Design goal:
part of a larger assembly, 5 chains, A little secondary structure, B mainly alpha, C alpha/beta, D alpha/beta, B: mainly alpha, Methane Monooxygenase Hydroxylase, Chain G, domain 1, 3 helices, 0% strand, rod-shaped, D: alpha/beta, Rossmann fold, 60s Ribosomal Protein L30, Chain: A, Helix Hairpins, two-stranded antiparallel sheet, 15 helices, 12 strands, binds guanosine-5'-triphosphate, binds guanosine-5'-diphosphate, binds magnesium ion, Stathmin-4 (chain B)
């Protein structure tokens, strides 16, 4: 899954 | 009556003295029993953490064999 | 002569101590810098107020007290507060790390680091006394210092002072302001340990005091400063006989004689009146006859007990202010008629009364109306045992699953110490039952 | 008095950094370390988390640690990077390719001695050190493996101080890494024996909150972290402001942990919008607002801390907190009376006018460990990926021990859930 | 009974 702060 | 008048007052001293005695003792026993029980709980804690330090070497000294082959 | 040394242990003990000594100062005309313009005996004195206050050269009246805590926050506020100048620094004794709501930490781990210093300072006060009566010890049942260190000090004081009287003011835990889930545990332990070292203990139930602040003073959510101000009035009533004197005054030790039939049955029930707001008190003055009646209304009790379902072993009335013998006598006649008030068969039924003409004062910005006359009833009723039962049930539920017991063992205590404390509490409830039974 | 902070690894240093950003704000501490606040309640108990350097500079008593430097330069380059004491940066290079073994035994152990040097520097300074709080993830290798090493190394030097962890549980919905069910079960094996109190931060819950509740089309890590910081400021409010209840780490553990092992907490926050007191109270006891992926109504509450922050009526909080215990009476174990406590802090968190932070030790937390153990035994029944570990010299038994030990913990939660009075 | 000479 594509998750950057 | 005079012999009895002394027996009564020295009985009161003996009992108030003994209250002070028992108390002083019951304290010193349960204060020492406490020191021992805590020192022990701390010792066993430090124990378990120090056998985790020798298991940690048996892992660093297990890999040190595998690498070299 | 007949000096009395107050010992304020832990937060509750200290904060209640603040309220009390502020109030005493307002009652004796003592400024927060210790100076007292009434006292002409400079440097010394024989007066009634000298049992709670020593004097110095400078003209400074100094509380015969010690404030002890295992952590500095609460006593630090005393050191910097309105009445800072009143004490001498050696009297305010602090640790660094508290007892974390742990009896074991208070009695042992942390307490042992400071017990000697406290006794050294207590001793230094005793040396100022021509004839010490004894000690008053203010503490919470629930705190770790309040419970554990108090037991330690009391045991140590039994030893260093033999059988000089030791009275407790013990704050009994209430859920509306409880700080620890384990307060039942701490309660049963200190009560057991202190039982044979305490001559007389006045339990203050916080739920009772929270109830009265809510109901009679219309305080929405009571604070500690609320409870303390009410509690102080009650303590003031009980110590009034020791700090004032007049023809009609009866010494507390006399009340003590009536109140304790056996050395273990030393927990009197306090009931105080009138607790009334300034709004209600305006234009409505309360009579000797009216406040006396309140004493038998359980809403005004200091411990949540029901004396009606229990039997009386004694009744004392500590009047202060505008009270005359004539009116008191008629007042009790009424209640002897209008109530039932069962006594055990082995006790007489007379009420021991004392009167101090010195009227109740109040603290500025207090919530309590400044009344002309007031009264504290001290009763020895079997119903007080209800307090033990509620706490013993709470204790029972947790120890069944040994819940939380591990924070105690880890500090050095045993399961045996628990079961033992609990057996004493069972005996005490049994004892409080045995006395209610009729004779043969 | 003083707490010493330790953040470790990618996740550890991210959530750690945000935690400081946030409470630095609440206490009115700027990125340089000066105070510019209005209220004196701010500096009352500032010493708990900050040292007072020369020139009235407040400095996070915080130690930063990693095996790759990647994350830590991001921090020093961050908004607050300079506030930190530069010496307290302690990062290796050899890294840990999300291998728990590399953090614990092999790659982490050469660096462990240098981290501990920095701890001692901060601990010797403490007027009264109460203990340590740690930030880290349980899916990775540095934070997971070397964090658990560190705890054990610190405990045997500070065995009577409190050990507290904000541990981040791994979920597939957030990391496609395959070995995470191994890393977690291995560190959880350490946590049960060696921490006093452990805040379970569940990513399945942080994602689901963000996607379901916050309608974030695609949630970022910073999105998840904005929840984590809200929680962390929430559960440490009582540690940092002059208060009554749970004012230090020990007094909290004593009120929260009835049995030494069962110390895994289910934190809650409200409002979760990212507003009334009866609404706050209900929300913070609702499944959706839980920061661990559990329905508390699938178990019983052993103990609970509730912290209400903001200007509100304390009579109302009192009546409401009694409301929810009465109505939900069945969900609180009988044999621990008065197991729910309530704090109230005047100072609202930044942005909100009033919040509610929840902290509960529920036997419903067993739901979270069961999910990890299904992900674990599925991969381990086949002995998959075990070369990454045994390679580092480990033993297959140490997996079983970690398996069976973690299974004991769940039983224990079920035991006390099924217990009764008389 | 309250009774002073
Ligand atoms: N009436 C009244 N009760 C108080 C006060 N302060 C604390 N308490 C009660 O005392 C109990 C907690 O014990 P504390 O006195 O606060 O704790 P402590 O004696 O300082 O012991 P530790 O803090 O654990 O070291 C609770 O049940 C409180 O409700 C107070 O100022 N007034
Ligand atoms: N909530 C949150 N979780 C993270 C973050 N970074 C990594 N993780 C989680 O941590 C696990 C991987 O551990 P990681 O921190 O990358 O290991 P490390 O390289 O040793 O520090 C995965 O389950 C991630 O979902 C973050 O910034 N926030
Ligand atoms: Mg305290
Ligand atoms: Mg004089």
């Amino acid at each position: 899954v594509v998750x950057x702060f | 009556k005079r012999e009895h008048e002394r027996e009564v007052i020295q009985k009161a001293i003996e009992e108030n003295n003994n209250f002070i005695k028992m108390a002083k003792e019951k304290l010193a026993q349960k204060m020492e029993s406490n020191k021992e029980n805590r020192e022990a709980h701390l010792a066993a804690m430090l124990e378990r953490l120090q056998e985790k330090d020798k298991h940690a070497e048996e892992v660093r000294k297990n890999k040190e064999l595998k690498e070299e082959a | 002569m007949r000096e009395c040394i107050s010992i304020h242990v832990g937060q509750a003990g200290v904060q209640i101590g603040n309220a009390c000594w502020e109030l005493y100062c307002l009652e004796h005309g003592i400024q927060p810098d210790g100076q007292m313009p009434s006292d002409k005996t400079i440097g010394g004195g024989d007066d009634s107020f000298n049992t709670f206050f020593s004097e110095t050269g400078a003209g400074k009246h100094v509380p015969r007290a010690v404030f002890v805590d295992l952590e500095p926050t609460v006593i630090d506020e005393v050191r910097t507060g309105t009445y800072r100048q009143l004490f001498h620094p050696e009297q305010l004794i602090t640790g660094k790390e508290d007892a974390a709501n742990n009896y074991a930490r208070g009695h042992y781990t942390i307490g042992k680091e400071i017990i000697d210093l406290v006794l050294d300072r207590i001793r230094k006060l005793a040396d100022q006394c021509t004839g010490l009566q004894g000690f008053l010890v203010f503490h919470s049942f629930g705190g770790g210092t309040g419970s554990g260190f108090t037991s330690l000090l009391m045991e140590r004081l039994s030893v260093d002072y033999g059988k000089k009287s030791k009275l407790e003011f013990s704050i009994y835990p209430a859920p509306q302001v409880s700080t620890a889930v384990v307060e039942p545990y701490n309660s049963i332990l200190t009560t057991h340990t202190t039982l044979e070292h305490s001559d007389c203990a006045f339990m203050v139930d916080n739920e009772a005091i929270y109830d009265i602040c809510r109901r009679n003073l219309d305080i929405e959510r009571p604070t500690y400063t609320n409870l303390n101000r009410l509690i102080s009035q009650i303590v003031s009533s009980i110590t009034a006989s020791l700090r004032f004197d007049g023809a009609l005054n009866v010494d507390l030790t006399e009340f003590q004689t009536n109140l304790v039939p056996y050395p273990r049955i030393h927990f009197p029930l306090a009931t105080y009146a009138p607790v009334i707001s300034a709004e209600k008190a305006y234009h409505e003055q309360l009579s000797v006859a009216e406040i006396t009646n309140a004493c038998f209304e359980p809403a005004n009790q200091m411990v949540k007990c029901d004396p009606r379902h229990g039997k009386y072993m004694a009744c004392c009335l500590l009047y202060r202010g505008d009270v005359v013998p004539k009116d008191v006598n008629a007042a009790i006649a009424t209640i002897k008629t209008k109530r039932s008030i069962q006594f055990v068969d082995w006790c007489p039924t007379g009420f021991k009364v004392g009167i101090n003409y010195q009227p109740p004062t109040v603290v500025p910005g207090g919530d309590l109306a400044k009344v002309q006359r007031a009264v504290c009833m001290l009763s020895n009723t079997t119903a007080i045992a209800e307090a033990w039962a509620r706490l013993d049930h709470k204790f029972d539920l947790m120890y069944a699953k040994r819940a939380f017991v591990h924070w105690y063992v880890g500090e050095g205590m045993e399961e045996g110490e628990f079961s033992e404390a609990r057996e004493d509490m069972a005996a005490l409830e049994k004892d409080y039952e045995e006395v209610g039974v009729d004779s043969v | 008095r003083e707490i010493v902070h330790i953040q470790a690894g990618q996740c550890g240093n991210q959530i750690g950094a945000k935690f400081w950003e946030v409470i630095s704000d609440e206490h009115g501490i700027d990125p340089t370390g000066s105070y510019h606040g209005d209220s004196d309640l701010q500096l009352e108990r500032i010493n708990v988390y900050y040292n007072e350097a020369t020139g009235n500079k407040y400095v996070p008593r915080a130690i930063l640690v990693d095996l790759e430097p990647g994350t830590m330069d991001s921090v020093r380059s961050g908004p607050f990077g300079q506030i930190f004491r530069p010496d307290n940066f302690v990062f290796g290079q050899s890294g840990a390719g999300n291998n728990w073994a590399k953090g614990h035994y092999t790659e982490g152990a050469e660096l462990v001695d240098s981290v501990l040097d920095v701890v001692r520097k901060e601990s010797e300074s403490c007027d009264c050190l109460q203990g340590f709080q740690l930030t880290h993830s349980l899916g990775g290798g540095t934070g997971s493996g070397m964090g658990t090493l560190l705890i054990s190394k610190i405990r045997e030097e500070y065995p009577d101080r409190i050990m507290n962890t904000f541990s981040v549980m791994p979920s597939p919905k957030v990391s496609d890494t395959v070995v995470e069910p191994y890393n977690a079960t291995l560190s959880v094996h350490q946590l049960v024996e060696n921490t006093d109190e452990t805040y379970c931060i569940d990513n399945e819950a942080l994602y689901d909150i963000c996607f379901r509740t916050l309608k974030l089309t695609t949630p970022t890590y910073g999105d998840l972290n904005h929840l984590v910081s809200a929680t962390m400021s929430g559960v440490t409010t009582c540690l940092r402001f002059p208060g009554q209840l749970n004012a230090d780490l020990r007094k909290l553990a004593v009120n929260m942990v009835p049995f030494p092992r069962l110390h895994f907490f289910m934190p809650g926050f409200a409002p979760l919008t990212s507003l009334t007191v009866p609404e706050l109270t209900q929300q913070m006891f609702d499944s959706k607002n839980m920061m661990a992926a559990c329905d508390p109504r699938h178990g019983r509450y052993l103990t609970v801390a509730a912290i209400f922050r903001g200007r509100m009526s304390m009579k109302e909080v009192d009546e409401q907190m009694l409301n929810v215990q009465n109505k939900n009476s069945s969900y609180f174990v009988e044999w621990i009376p008065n197991n729910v406590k309530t704090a109230v802090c005047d100072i609202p968190p930044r942005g909100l006018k009033m919040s509610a932070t929840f902290i509960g030790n529920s036997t419903a937390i067993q739901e979270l460990f069961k999910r990890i153990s299904e992900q674990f035994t599925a991969m381990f029944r086949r002995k998959a990926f075990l070369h990454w570990y045994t390679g580092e010299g480990m033993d297959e038994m140490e997996f079983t021990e970690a398996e069976s030990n973690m299974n004991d913990l769940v039983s224990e939660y079920q035991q006390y859930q099924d217990a009764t009075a008389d």
